[PDB]
Symmetry: D2
Subunit: 30 residues, 4 copies
């Protein structure tokens, strides 16, 4: 249903944010 589609999109964006945070950590360390 529409709710499941939205939840899946939220999880995907959360994972993208984790990947960006990792990149920031990598840049911060050097």
């Amino acid at each position: 249903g529409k709710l499941e589609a939205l939840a899946q999109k939220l999880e995907a964006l959360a994972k993208k944010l984790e990947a960006l945070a990792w990149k920031l950590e990598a840049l911060a360390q050097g």
Copy 2:
């Protein structure tokens, strides 16, 4: 330093988003 602190704040937000995704998915499955 400041970038690492920012990355940790981003990770904290991403964790809260994922928690919301599990909650929305449970509502969808219920």
Copy 3:
């Protein structure tokens, strides 16, 4: 512009989250 590029990606992600919140609220009101 490595940090500026990441900041732009973070802003875009936030706007996608805001669109999802709007869609969830629209589903709630339906």
Copy 4:
């Protein structure tokens, strides 16, 4: 009800992410 409460939590998280994106851009420019 619940969906609206969850949507508001998501909107609040998105706004916090925007503040973090702003802070990253500010750090990058100075």
